Amino acid sequence: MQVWPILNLKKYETLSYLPPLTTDQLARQVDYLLNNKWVPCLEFETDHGFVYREHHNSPGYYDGRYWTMWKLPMFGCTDPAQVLNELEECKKEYPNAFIRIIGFDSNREVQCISFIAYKPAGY
Amino acid sequence: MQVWPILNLKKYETLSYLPPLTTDQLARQVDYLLNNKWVPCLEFETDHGFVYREHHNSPGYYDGRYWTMWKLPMFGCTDPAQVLNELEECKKEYPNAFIRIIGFDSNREVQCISFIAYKPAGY
Amino acid sequence: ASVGFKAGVKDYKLTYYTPEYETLDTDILAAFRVSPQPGVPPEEAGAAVAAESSTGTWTTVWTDGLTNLDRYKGRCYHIEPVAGEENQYICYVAYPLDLFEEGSVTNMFTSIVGNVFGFKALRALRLEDLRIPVAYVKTFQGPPHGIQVERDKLNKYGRPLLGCTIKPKLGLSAKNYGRAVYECLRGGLDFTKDDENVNSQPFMRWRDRFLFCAEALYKAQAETGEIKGHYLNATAGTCEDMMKRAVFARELGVPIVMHDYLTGGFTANTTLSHYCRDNGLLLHIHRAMHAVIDRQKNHGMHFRVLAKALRLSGGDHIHSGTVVGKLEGERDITLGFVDLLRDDYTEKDRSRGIYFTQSWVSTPGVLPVASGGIHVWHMPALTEIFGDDSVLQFGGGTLGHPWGNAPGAVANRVALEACVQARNEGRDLAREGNTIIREATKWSPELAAACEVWK
Amino acid sequence: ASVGFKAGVKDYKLTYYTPEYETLDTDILAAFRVSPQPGVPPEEAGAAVAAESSTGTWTTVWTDGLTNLDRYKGRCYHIEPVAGEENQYICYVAYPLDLFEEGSVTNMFTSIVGNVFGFKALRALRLEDLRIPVAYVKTFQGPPHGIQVERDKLNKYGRPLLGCTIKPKLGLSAKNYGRAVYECLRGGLDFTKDDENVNSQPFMRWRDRFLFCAEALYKAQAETGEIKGHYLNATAGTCEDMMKRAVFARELGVPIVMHDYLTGGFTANTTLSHYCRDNGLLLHIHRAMHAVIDRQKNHGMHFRVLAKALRLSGGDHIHSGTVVGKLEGERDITLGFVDLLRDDYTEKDRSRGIYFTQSWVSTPGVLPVASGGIHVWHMPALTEIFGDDSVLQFGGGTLGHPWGNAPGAVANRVALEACVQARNEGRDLAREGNTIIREATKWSPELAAACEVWK
Amino acid sequence: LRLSGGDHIHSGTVVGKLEGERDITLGFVDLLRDDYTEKDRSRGIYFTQSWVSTPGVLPVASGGIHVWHMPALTEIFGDDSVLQFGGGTLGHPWGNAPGAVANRVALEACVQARNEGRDLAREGNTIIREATKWSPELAAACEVWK
Ligand SMILES: O=C(COP(=O)(O)O)[C@H](O)[C@H](O)COP(=O)(O)O
Ligand SMILES: O=C(COP(=O)(O)O)[C@H](O)[C@H](O)COP(=O)(O)O
Ligand SMILES: O=C(COP(=O)(O)O)[C@H](O)[C@H](O)COP(=O)(O)O
Ligand SMILES: [Ca+2]
Ligand SMILES: [Ca+2]
């Protein structure tokens, strides 16, 4: 009988309960997006990588949901390598930031995916 | 005439104003539970071992009352040694956490006891 | 009921004394201690009590024929002599469920006790007990929270709760009053309290008191890490003023308010009880004026009746006196109404003054509050008599400590915890109480100081 | 007050027995009938009553030094033996104006009577009278209307008003209840009334009763040309329900509502009193439960105290019992509190149970209501004893008439008017009462019929 | 309910029933989520239904489900669904938290696999078993059920 840990066990939604993705796994998730005609984009956050409530408390209001966009969504991107190269540029510039890959479905007209691609040391 | 101290004098409810319990005293309190047919269970907290108010302020609402359960209540437990062994496993794993023993009375259908069994260094 | 009219006086007796009556589970039953005037036989007296608290009229009226009065009459179905008293009997009376307004303790008392006590054929009359049927119990809210929920909200388990009445009741300014509150709470007491007399007065208006008491309690809570409360007295002259007071307590986010239910009255008490349930406020009830009614054995109403009424109307705590300073029997009577306040079911037991078996169909229990001239030395006794589910209050027993409020509080909290630990270890509080206290003085200067001052 | 602390018990006596004290015009004075336990001397008992109803603590507390407790203590300033009673005394106690919340009868009773009755040194205790200073009287509204305004609104002058309680209290349907009301009013009675028990119950919900009673009263008013009223009972379980009832009475445009002030309670009563003043409703007060408190001579509170409290809280009528069936002295006591209810100033008079001179600084008087087993033959007596400013109520005395409610009403109205005319002509009601009634039977078949049935 | 209003609505489990009943469920699931559903008698849809942009409702699968039904549920309902586990969570041998972890890991393993192109219908049990290798919580659950 194991007791689920309490300290430093913050999660980042989809796929965050699995062992961290290898470059191959990461590339396979990116291909899923491309094959579905979804637009990939990267987001990073250096301050609080988790949800909190500072500016308001009414139902459905939370701070920390929006992170900052790395460049622009990658319209027309056809190669998972392009995306992963960007993840590298981003990590190079923000080695202290959490980085996640998100995707947009222009037909459903909504953001449709979001998975942590990089966590800074000790997370 | 002595002046009751102000610093580092946080308490933990029942039995916390007595000198810390020895293993024998601790075992005697556990036998009290068993003899009354109450189910023992352990809880631990690493962050704030005391009551506070972060998420709401209405009457009767306080944060920090719930701690996290160590395993499950010890149904059928008949030996104080079992309980104390668990206190040891818990301390082994969370030497930095406050640990308390609680008991449930399934007939009154309520948690009925709660006493601090372990305080981390400097508390 | 019915007629063939013909006006005129007539006689009760045959109509209201129904010794063959089998009570219904829906009936409200009353046990009256009747002291008839000389010359009035018991059956006659019992019949008078029943007639006079229901349908008995002094002269025949034609309208009785438009109904079936039998369906509405009170019936004396049993009478038994009182031992060691000449011409004194216990008469049992049954009242049909239909005579009462649902959820109204005000109407329950008006119907049973509103008229009979002045009947000339009686020398004296005392209501000893009422059997409230479960169908009527279900029409009331009962305690806003009750024992189980209160402990869960406060996170306090396995020991009596501790309080302290701030003294002097009148004279202190709101700020000095709050200073006393903070010093008491920081020492280990769970609650502090407004005297029953403290409402709003020239030297201390209510809002100022509530405000400083809030500052004091939050400071004591932050210092100790344990949840604290101060019974803010909301008793007032009108329903509107009482509500204004409860509303500010809500705004402050504090946990508990107080009401003098007998001087305020049942109509106002039920309003405050409903508000507390809807707003998550615990309600401490003070029994001011009870002895005006419940003290004399031959006339009035025994406190157990006033306690049942409060459990129906609603309160989370209620003062039940100390068992200290009195012989057994009175000790047994107290333990008897304590069960009636806390438990879900209490079987008839004349040795404890319980005349009827009473069920509560899950209506929450009320925490009894022991108060009145108690200090550290009564601790083993109080813990033994009341058990964990009680609130022990020390006014002079705390503010009278030689080193001040905080050490006064520590002394009481240590004394209580020493007793709880001892009891849990299997020690006999009744036999070893003084030894348990003395051992604690060895390591508690605060307790040792207190023990020197008292008894 | 003050200190040089040093914890410990200490003794009252010297501190609370101040036989040299000169009372202030702002003090609230109380006359307590004290029955000390054997061995307790009178000065000791009086001092205990004062300490126990103000600042007396069981052990010295340090906070007393933060105030001047002398300014706040109750003081026993006089003691006098009770004749024909061993070990029983009248102790006079003075309470400073500052101890009380303005406009709150609830706080006045909590302060004086909330604690002392249970003091062990006393065998029994009874509050006989209170001197309410005019500065405190001015903080209350008093009656919503009072004697003078009520007569002006109703346009009724020179004779007692007449009422009738509808019976049976429970059992009739709202419509049959209203039928009884119309038959009573059309015969000459001014008011009809809900029994104290009639609030809202299974066979007759309140709204239906109010509605049919309105139809009945308007029909009786249109028929006779005289203004009529029905005391609609607004007593309820909560303040909210009570207000709902008063509001509907307002909507109906009727003139008077009713409240059981003791079972409802002072907090709710003051709320209803304020509402009646703001809405032009007369308020009839029923004293249900009074005998639980005021009957025994050695313990409780005398009714004159409960009557003063009602005049402050507010009511336009209040039940004062009948003077019939009792010896002088009890007759004198009743006449004494009747003056206390109606007049602006009443001088101390121990022969009538008036322990203090009482001024009301123009607070309106309350109409006393004589009720209880009375019929046509008591009319000369009632008129003589109460005078014009009273309400005489006949329940069985009206609904018990052989020809029905209307003739029952006519009999009472004729009997009353015959007495008033006779008194006005200079006839002695005390000596010629029966002759005055008999002469009226010669021309009133209704009255003659009634006279045959009773006494 | 979609007209009156609700954000989630219980739609039963497709588990424990034959095709057809499976097809009927998938049919009303489309009616709850989509903006337009063409008539299809094979799925019990008697009329073509348009919703003119009225928001879709999230279907909730509930009723006797546990970790082993995960590949199936993910395959049948897709992403836009709420999977509810009462006994499937509070019945875990180590308690609620590990019970929750087991369900969250099982679901994420299936999502990752599906995204990688694995066939949930054919490889479901293999996807679950591989996850037990690194998840003691999931392994514990798998031992208790089916
Ligand atoms: O003020 C106190 C006690 O102060 P102290 O703790 O200093 O004795 C309480 O209100 C009464 O004892 C209650 O009376 P009852 O128990 O008769 O309701
Ligand atoms: O119902 C009646 C009288 O009916 P009846 O007119 O038929 O006697 C009155 O309420 C009581 O007498 C009042 O009691 P008290 O005077 O003690 O307040
Ligand atoms: O309580 C549960 C399931 O508990 P468990 O997860 O332990 O099975 C759900 O409410 C029902 O399954 C819904 O019924 P329906 O789907 O027919 O609306
Ligand atoms: Ca008090
Ligand atoms: Ca009556």
Experimental method: X-ray
Contacts of C59 in chain D (CB under 8 A): 375, 396-397, 400, 453-454
Does any CB of chain C come closer than 8 Å to the CB of residue D327? no
Distances (CA, A) of D249 to D85, D212, D256, D281: 51, 12, 8, 9
Contacts of B70 in chain A (CB under 8 A): 3
The answer to whether the beta carbons of residues C97 and C27 sit under 8 Å apart is yes
The answer to whether the beta carbons of residues C264 and C235 sit under 8 Å apart is yes
CB atoms within 10 A of CB D83: 6
Question: Could you tell me how far CA D362 lies from the centroid of its own chain?
Answer: 18
Supply angle C-alpha A95, A63, A56, rounded to 5. 155
Distances (CA, A) of D298 to C126, C287, D355: 15, 22, 16
CA of C319 from ligand 1 middle (Å) equals 9
Sign of the dihedral through C-alpha C225, C216, C246, D64: positive
Residues A35, A36, A37, A38, Cα dihedral to 10°: -110
CA of C29 from ligand 5 middle (Å) equals 21
DSSP designation for C21: -
Pocket mutation for ligand 3, best pick of E8, E60, E62 (most atoms within 8 Å of C-beta): E62
Paired strand residues for C33: C90, C126
Q: Annotation-wise, does E69 bind a ligand? A: no
Among A6, A9, A51, A58, the strongest candidate for a mutation testing the B interface, having the largest count of B CBs within 10 A, is A6
CA distance C418 to C428: 13
The answer to whether the beta carbons of residues C122 and D227 sit under 8 Å apart is no
Which of A57, D66, A55, D118 is closest to C262 using CA atoms? D118
User: DSSP letters along D170-227, please?
Assistant: SSS-HHHHHHHHHHHHHTT-SEEE--TT-SSBTTB-HHHHHHHHHHHHHHHHHHHSS-
| Close Cβ partners of E22 (under 8 Å, ≥ 6 residues apart) | E14, E76
Catalytic residue among C145, C259, C286, C302: C286
CA distance B102 to B117: 10
**Residue positions forming the annotated binding site of C:** 57, 115, 165, 169, 193, 195-196, 286-287, 319, 326, 371, 373, 395-396
Which of D194, D138, D176, D145 is closest to D25 using CA atoms? D138
Helix (H), strand (E), coil (C) string for A47-113: CCCCCECCCCCCCCCCECCCCEEECCCCCCCCCHHHHHHHHHHHHHHCCCCEEEEEEEECCCCEEEE
CA distance D219 to D288: 30
Name the residue with tokens 């306080």: B62
Active site residues of D: 167, 286
Question: In chain B, what is the greatest distance between 2 CA atoms, to the nearest angstrom?
Answer: 50
Give the relative orientation of helices D429-441 and D405-424 as an angle to the nearest 10 degrees. 130
Which of D125, D66, D118, D127 is closest to D95 using CA atoms? D127
Contacts of C419 in chain B (CB under 8 A): none
| Close Cβ partners of D125 (under 8 Å, ≥ 6 residues apart) | D32, D33, D34, D35, D49, D116, D117, D119, D299
Which of A61, A67, A62 is closest to A47 using CA atoms? A67
Closest residue to C264, CB basis, from D200, D236, D267 = D267
Q: Which CATH homologous superfamily contains domain D14-140?
A: RuBisCO large subunit, N-terminal domain (3.30.70.150)
Question: A64: exposed, middle or buried (C-beta count within 10 Å: 0-12, 13-18, 19+)?
Answer: middle
Residues E63, E65, E70, E71, Cα dihedral to 10°: -80
- Report domain extents, chain D: 14-140, 141-454
CA distance D49 to D43: 10
Which atom belonging to ligand 2 lies closest to the Cα atom of D196? 10
Pocket-forming residues, ligand 1, beta carbon under 6 Å? C 165, 195-196, 287, 319, 321, 371-373, 393-397; D 57-58, 118
Question: Could you tell me how far CA C21 lies from the centroid of its own chain?
Answer: 32
CA distance C437 to C423: 12
Q: Annotation-wise, does D396 bind a ligand? A: yes
Whether residues B71 and A3 touch (CB distance < 8 A) is answered with yes
Distances (CA, A) of D63 to C175, C186, C398: 13, 17, 11
Let me know if chains A and C touch, i.e. at least 3 Cβ pairs under 8 angstroms.
no
Alpha helices, H only, C14-146? 42-52, 105-113, 134-137
Size of chain E in residues:
146
Element holding E126 (H helix, E strand): helix E120-132
Size of chain D in residues:
455
Give the relative orientation of helices D105-113 and D266-279 as an angle to the nearest 10 degrees. 160
Element holding C400 (H helix, E strand): none
Phi and psi at residue A44, to the nearest 5°: -135, 155
Whether residues C402 and B14 touch (CB distance < 8 A) is answered with no
Question: Could you tell me how far CA D47 lies from the centroid of its own chain?
Answer: 30
Distances (CA, A) of D223 to A118, B106, D220: 94, 71, 5
Question: Could you tell me how far CA E30 lies from the centroid of its own chain?
Answer: 14
Q: Which is it for strands D122-131 and D28-36: parallel, antiparallel or unpaired?
A: antiparallel
Sign of the dihedral through C-alpha D134, D135, D141, D145: positive
The answer to whether the beta carbons of residues C229 and C282 sit under 8 Å apart is yes
Phi and psi at residue C236, to the nearest 5°: -150, 180
Distances (CA, A) of A19 to A29, A43, E112: 14, 21, 11
Nearest-CA residue of chain D relative to C372?
Answer: D58
**Residue positions forming the annotated binding site of C for substrate:** 57, 115, 165, 169, 196, 286-287, 319, 326, 371, 373, 395-396
**How close B71 gets to chain C, by Cα (Å)?**
21
Supply angle C-alpha C339, C344, C349, rounded to 5. 45
Size of chain A in residues:
123
Q: Which residues of A touch E (CB under 8 A)?
A: 1-4, 14-19, 25, 28-29, 32
The number of C-alpha atoms within 13 Å of D222 and in the hemisphere containing its C-beta is 7
Question: Could you tell me how far CA D109 lies from the centroid of its own chain?
Answer: 15
Residues D388, D390, D396, D399, Cα dihedral to 10°: 70
Among C58, C106, C320, the strongest candidate for a mutation testing the D interface, having the largest count of D CBs within 10 A, is C106
CA distance D143 to D309: 11
Whether residues A3 and B72 touch (CB distance < 8 A) is answered with no
The protein residue with its alpha carbon nearest to ligand 3, atom 15, reads E12
Size of chain B in residues:
123
| Close Cβ partners of C94 (under 8 Å, ≥ 6 residues apart) | C21, C23, C24, C27, C28, C29, C30, C74, C75, C77
| Close Cβ partners of C39 (under 8 Å, ≥ 6 residues apart) | none
Give the relative orientation of helices D206-224 and D239-252 as an angle to the nearest 10 degrees. 30
User: DSSP letters along D42-74, please?
Assistant: HHHHHHHHHHHTTT--SS--GGGGGS-GGGT--
CA distance B45 to A29: 38
Domains of chain A, CATH where assigned: 1-123 (3.30.190.10)
CA distance D258 to D27: 33
Say if ligand 2 is within 6 A of residue C58 CB.
Answer: yes
Name the residue with tokens 């301050």: A47
**Collapsing DSSP states into helix, strand and coil, what is residue E1?**
coil
Q: Which ligand is nearest to the CA of E14?
A: 3
Which tokens is D24 given? 């202030």
Contacts of A3 in chain B (CB under 8 A): 70-71, 93
The answer to whether the beta carbons of residues B75 and B39 sit under 8 Å apart is yes
Which tokens is E84 given? 């509810």
Phi and psi at residue E52, to the nearest 5°: 40, 55
Closest residue to A7, CB basis, from B46, B70, B71 = B46
Question: Could you tell me how far CA C45 lies from the centroid of its own chain?
Answer: 30
Give the relative orientation of helices E70-77 and E21-33 as an angle to the nearest 10 degrees. 50
Whether residues A6 and B46 touch (CB distance < 8 A) is answered with yes
The correct CATH number of C141-454 out of 3.20.20.110, 3.40.30.10, 3.40.50.300, 3.20.20.80 is 3.20.20.110
Which of E52, E53, E51, E28 is closest to E40 using CA atoms? E28
The answer to whether the beta carbons of residues C293 and C344 sit under 8 Å apart is no
Name the residue with tokens 């001239």: C373
Does any CB of chain C come closer than 8 Å to the CB of residue D270? yes
DSSP designation for C159: S
| Close Cβ partners of C327 (under 8 Å, ≥ 6 residues apart) | none
The protein residue with its alpha carbon nearest to ligand 3, atom 2, reads E63
CA distance D19 to D35: 19
Whether residues B68 and A1 touch (CB distance < 8 A) is answered with no
Which of C257, C254, C238, C237 is closest to C246 using CA atoms? C257
DSSP designation for D155: T
Pocket mutation for ligand 1, best pick of D57, D60, D115, D120 (most atoms within 8 Å of C-beta): D115
Phi and psi at residue C32, to the nearest 5°: -100, 135
Say if ligand 3 is within 6 A of residue E87 CB.
Answer: yes
Sheet holding A39-45, edge to edge: A68-70, A39-45, A98-105, A110-118
Supply angle C-alpha D159, D160, D162, rounded to 5. 125
CA of D166 from ligand 2 middle (Å) equals 11
The answer to whether the beta carbons of residues D75 and D92 sit under 8 Å apart is no
Whether residues E137 and A4 touch (CB distance < 8 A) is answered with yes
Element holding E33 (H helix, E strand): helix E21-33
